[PDB]
Scaffold this active site. Structure first.
Site, PDB file in Angstrom:
ATOM      1  N   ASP A 173       0.815  -1.213  -0.130  1.00 56.37           N
ATOM      2  CA  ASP A 173       0.139   0.139  -0.030  1.00 56.37           C
ATOM      3  C   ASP A 173       0.780   1.454   0.085  1.00 56.37           C
ATOM      4  O   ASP A 173       1.748   1.323   0.798  1.00 56.37           O
ATOM      5  CB  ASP A 173      -0.992  -0.109   1.049  1.00 56.37           C
ATOM      6  CG  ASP A 173      -1.875   1.237   1.420  1.00 56.37           C
ATOM      7  OD1 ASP A 173      -2.498   1.553   0.820  1.00 56.37           O
ATOM      8  OD2 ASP A 173      -1.369   1.589   2.558  1.00 56.37           O
ATOM      9  N   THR A 215      -5.241   6.794  -3.497  1.00 59.44           N
ATOM     10  CA  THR A 215      -3.843   7.407  -2.718  1.00 59.44           C
ATOM     11  C   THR A 215      -2.643   6.648  -3.500  1.00 59.44           C
ATOM     12  O   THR A 215      -1.489   7.563  -3.705  1.00 59.44           O
ATOM     13  CB  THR A 215      -3.950   7.407  -1.476  1.00 59.44           C
ATOM     14  OG1 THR A 215      -5.170   7.903  -1.148  1.00 59.44           O
ATOM     15  CG2 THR A 215      -2.989   8.525  -0.894  1.00 59.44           C
ATOM     16  N   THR A 216      -2.435   5.336  -3.638  1.00 61.13           N
ATOM     17  CA  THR A 216      -1.419   4.597  -4.292  1.00 61.13           C
ATOM     18  C   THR A 216      -1.148   4.995  -5.695  1.00 61.13           C
ATOM     19  O   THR A 216      -0.068   5.501  -5.823  1.00 61.13           O
ATOM     20  CB  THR A 216      -1.525   3.019  -4.483  1.00 61.13           C
ATOM     21  OG1 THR A 216      -1.660   2.602  -3.054  1.00 61.13           O
ATOM     22  CG2 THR A 216      -0.089   2.412  -4.714  1.00 61.13           C
ATOM     23  N   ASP A 251     -13.085  -2.887   2.522  1.00 59.67           N
ATOM     24  CA  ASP A 251     -12.851  -2.561   1.260  1.00 59.67           C
ATOM     25  C   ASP A 251     -14.158  -2.763   0.312  1.00 59.67           C
ATOM     26  O   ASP A 251     -14.720  -1.857  -0.585  1.00 59.67           O
ATOM     27  CB  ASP A 251     -11.863  -3.559   0.605  1.00 59.67           C
ATOM     28  CG  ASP A 251     -10.565  -3.083   1.121  1.00 59.67           C
ATOM     29  OD1 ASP A 251      -9.852  -3.738   2.163  1.00 59.67           O
ATOM     30  OD2 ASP A 251      -9.990  -1.767   0.735  1.00 59.67           O
TER      31      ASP A 251
END
Lengths: 519, 519, 519
Positions: free
Chosen positions: C49, C82-83, C387
């Site tokens: 991540d 965000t990754t 998730d």
């Protein structure tokens, strides 16, 4: 023995060849920045000529030696294109290297540049401009020929020189008269058949073409005929000198009368030789490897007009134009091998004496006589006729011209970025780099002129997109120009064709070399 | 092989050529400070001529070798303008150098210095005052000539010599008559037709013009004639000496009679040579590369006046005025080749002998005999005479004068700073930096004279602003002045026109160059 | 204090933010290579991540810190974007450095990226697909929702969990019922109202949604009712603890009995407070900062079930649903500030105790109960539920979905390289390098899968052109593929829109900053 790795060797060779190219590129345009060249003897030499800077400089990196060798091989056809050819070569190499950096095999790059060049040679006869094979005996109402001489002179120097330009246009008209034609549309004119003789003093307006031969020699003895009518001219290979056995007779220098008796013995052998030539009935004679002073008195007494050092090329033509046959030696002179002229005279040009040969059974070759002030103005005026002679011989020997000022190239860059879309895998990336490389030529000219290069490249592109091939940028103007054909900036097809062959040769050759072993 | 970068090189080549200039400018003008110059061999030379200081000093960095080449070429034409011209080239390089710092492409600067210069050449005949061609003869109630001969002496010297000046003014008058005049206020009698011979002893007042030619090389033996009336002159190029085969005849020393007969056989060849002359009936004879000792004795026995070592140029004048032939050799002499003089005499100047040929039809070249003092005071008086002939020659070949002391320069600076207003773009900064450079000449004169420069500029500017083409600074006076004509500070046009021509040449050429490659 | 130059400073802050991105990219996508990160205290940590790799590591240069702040802000909205977002910021920056090298001013580059971005935003509703707004009464025959939850697990895991995935599908179905209907045709549902409680020591199949609230806690003493019927629940802010004055009495160690009598006074105030609650008739009580042991003995004696540590979020969900009043302190306890529940009981989950509050007038909040095996296998079943719920809340709150597999990106790049044809000037040049940067995303996923990137881009480029939209590259299959919808690789509109929003922010920010002054 010095070794080198692969990868590293190609990068090291792209850098030398690339260092030569970006160093020549400040000198690219027709106002391009002049180089200064110091020898180890310390003499300084300032020029913008690009074939002169490669010759004048120590180059040693093997891949830099290949790129001069390409320039050199190109230098016999052109003076400006051989400049442009080195810049183009350099700009192809730095794009190839970017594809190698994405780890793409150079074999493929070589094959996609081969297909680019090939597409380009079938677009330049269609993109070309075709003119008449004969504007009313090819030179009437002058027009084309005057623009090539006013243009070529402006591009190679500019400044003041209108009274030079008109004379150069008359010379160019006189060579154009010579010209006999090819059934294609080219012509059988030849630089080589043209011979230019320069004499010191006075006015450039007194320069003329001659159908016969001019000998620039001042011709040996003042007492020899100053006009000959109905001249039988003998041509002889050797010295007029005694023929004797190699191993040399010895008499004592400590007897006076015998030093005089060797000297008089060789001198009665010369007086025999001159009598054989006056018995032959020669009125003029050429001897290429020299005439002794005693023999020149005896030739003058018998009434024979003698020439010395007439160089091999000028003799071939004198032979060929008067119907002579080359005679080896004075015993070998024989009475039907003599050629024939209507007259041979001595004429002064700029005070200096000069021999003009006319009344010639066939002279393919022609002579231009150039009289003019000083040495710098005479050497420069010869050079200037040369640059103008060479543009005329390129339009005469091929009827096709193409527009200049960045035009031709911008069109290859847009048709190639259209071609490269129909193209399949890994070949298309190479091709689209070759289309961009033509776009890297063109704008550098606008920076040479003092104007921003990138906004000038985009505005030519959008003019090229809504209009057609017409647009371009002029270094001499300093601006983008609507219509290139209007400002006289047409170029011979052969200045493009050769620099796309020699840039694609130099760059493919540096791509093809993966190793380097040095002793 | 030393390489150097573009952009980097242009700054280094302005610095070098700016440094040379900035070292020489303290020696500028009639109070300028003297340099001391020591050679490699150790010879010391104290001078303030500026063409001489560059000849005598080693210069190594190529762009300072270029300004020397500009000096060199100007030194063939003027001796005074060349000092000024090197400094001028410095004042143009330092305004260009600021424009290079503002990143303005040299092509534009090159072209603005060019438009400023083209305007200036059309401002300098309107700034000029033109006097007279020769109404009532040039030098009559002497005035203008007296003013240049007193003015040149003030510049070149500045010490007592009122009794030297009247004599120089008289010699100038004598030359001025000769003239041979050319259309539209020109003249043809010039420096290469003027000849000055200086002979020791007594007064400078005994100097004279001669219409004939004066020969400094003495008549030889006493027993030859020292005056010839109705002289028959033979002129001969070759040595009067025995001519004989290449490989040299030998007679043994240990046959002592036969060496003595070999010598007397060569004396019978010499006396023959002289006896030919005496048979021709030439009462005078000249041989350029010499007369044999026996041969000089026979010419004296026969009553023949013979002259030796006379120089190629003096011979040509003597040919032209006596109607003679330069004969090749005693073998070439033949009986229509002789010239004629009303008299030939040897006349003593400060006791010492000298041969004057006179009564000669049609000569254009003149000879000035300058007698006087011992040796140092005579070489300076010849030099002073030269300097006065060169002003008189700049005034003869154009009868145009221009005010000095900064009047022409301060007036070009305001007229250019009006011109540079009507021009648009960044090319107006370029016209206006050449107007600034002329204003950078002038104020330097006021500091060399020992006054504050910036306040002298403002005083000079305000008199130049309320009047018109008048006011200056004079180094001799050591003030500023309302009336710069009135104190005689006016220049011939040709020393202005050339030094502004040779400063724009040098600086324009140092700008065009972006590379310097050295072995 | 360290200073930094213009343009230099800018290149260095582009270099630090570049190094971060191109290091964070080796972890990109669901085949991405994991990093290992050891702390200063030595703690070993292995993750892929990207929001964690920036957190668990020290990043020093200020422009690289700015990029962690753009990451921190994006992590709070999405856990996948965000990754992707770190990598997207470096790829725009490395195109920006090429334009800066082209000598283009940042103000023009910034304005062209603004125009690329506004064009991109009007392109993301046209590419966008709306499935339904109500789907046969929502999660019905489930289909579309089954697919997004199974796909989100398959990207997040790719190994056996089938019998969790099915449970996850029932849970998503349960949360969907909850979701409330917007007139856009979206659904209001909120993660701040979703609650999941995990208990070790069962099987997953026994997980449930609950309408009322679950208290995870064991709830204090067994002696109190472990089921309450018609529960009057008191909610208390403070500790059940003494109220005695702060400026307080003291007691001697050697007065033994008076020490026991101070201890019994602090217990007799606690027993009054507990009796006061009991007179009010409360049945459950919650005290949020604690219950004294004496107060627990006495509250069980009165038949009252007391709770400790119920946190502030849980307390609001319980207030709003029971019609309680949060009370400050027992002195303030008062009889109508009590809420009402149908029952409150203890139920054993994984043999562990748990308290359920239900029969609640109008809860908006829901509770999900998660049973499973072990500790690591439960935390993972939680994370898997998280998730997938997060993927439902993004499809539910906007009714727009988009394709994946680098479909949107390849489509923006081609529409922009057409937009950029209708744009002019140097802002066109900047738009076309951004468009190219979108093309740099996409092909790196095919390299993580082992494919060749330049060959996967030419096969996608020709298929997106001759074919038609929804073409992509699937990293989980390992192929270029047409109709990526089929593969089920459809994403929320909000994961793309945000990752273009935050990359275009980071890159504009490092471009607006000229200088860096560091102490």
């Amino acid at each position: 023995t010095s070794r080198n790795s692969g990868r590293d060797a190609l990068k090291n060779n792209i850098l030398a060849a690339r260092t030569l190219a970006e160093m020549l590129r400040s000198s690219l345009g027709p106002k391009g920045l002049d180089k200064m060249l110091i020898d180890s003897f310390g003499d300084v030499t300032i020029t913008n000529d690009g074939a002169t800077i490669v010759k004048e400089m120590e180059i040693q990196h093997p891949a830099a030696k290949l790129l001069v060798e390409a320039a050199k091989a190109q230098d016999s056809e052109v003076g400006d294109g051989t400049t442009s050819a080195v810049v183009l070569a350099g700009l192809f190499l730095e794009k190839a290297e970017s594809l190698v950096d994405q780890n793409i095999h150079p074999t493929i790059i070589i094959e996609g540049f081969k297909k680019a060049f090939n597409k380009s040679l079938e677009l330049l006869p269609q993109l070309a401009t075709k003119v008449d094979v004969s504007d009313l005996n090819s030179a009437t109402a002058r027009d084309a020929l005057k623009k090539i001489v006013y243009t070529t002179m402006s591009s190679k120097f500019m400044a003041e020189g209108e009274e030079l330009n008109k004379i150069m246009d008359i010379v160019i008209d006189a060579v154009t008269t010579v010209a006999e034609p090819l059934p294609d549309g080219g012509y059988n004119v030849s630089l080589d058949l043209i011979k230019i003789d320069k004499k010191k003093g006075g006015t450039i307006e007194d320069s003329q073409l001659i159908r016969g031969i001019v000998l620039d020699k001042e011709v040996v003895h003042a007492g020899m005929p100053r006009r000959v009518e109905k001249a039988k001219i003998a041509v002889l290979d050797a010295s007029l000198e005694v023929e004797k056995p190699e191993i040399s007779a010895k008499i004592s220098i400590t007897s006076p009368d015998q030093i005089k008796a060797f000297l008089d013995e060789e001198a009665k052998y010369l007086k025999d030789m001159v009598d054989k030539l006056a018995s032959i009935g020669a009125n003029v004679v050429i001897c290429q490897k020299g005439i002794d002073d005693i023999a020149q008195h005896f030739l003058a007494k018998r009434g024979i007009l003698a020439v010395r050092r007439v160089k091999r090329s000028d003799i071939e033509k004198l032979e060929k134009a008067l119907g002579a046959r080359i005679i080896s030696s004075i015993k070998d002179a024989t009475p039907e091998d003599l050629g024939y002229a209507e007259l041979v005279e001595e004429r002064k040009v700029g005070n200096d004496k000069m021999v003009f040969i006319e009344g010639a059974k066939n002279p393919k070759a022609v002579n231009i006589l150039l009289r003019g002030s000083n040495d710098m103005a005479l050497d420069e005026a010869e050079r200037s006729i040369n640059d103008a002679l060479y543009s005329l011989r390129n339009i005469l020997m091929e009827p096709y011209i193409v527009p200049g000022g960045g035009a031709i190239e911008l069109e290859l860059s847009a048709r190639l970025r259209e071609y490269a879309r129909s193209v399949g895998g890994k070949e298309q990336l190479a091709i689209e780099a070759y289309a961009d490389a033509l776009e890297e030529i063109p704008m550098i000219l606008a920076e040479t002129a003092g104007l921003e290069p990138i906004s000038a490249l985009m505005d030519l592109r959008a003019r090229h997109a809504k209009g057609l091939t017409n647009c371009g940028v002029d270094v001499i103007n300093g601006k983008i120009i609507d219509d290139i054909y209007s400002i006289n900036v047409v170029e011979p097809i052969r200045v493009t064709r050769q620099v796309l062959k020699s840039a694609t040769e130099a760059a493919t050759s540096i791509m093809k070399i993966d190793d380097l072993i040095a002793a």
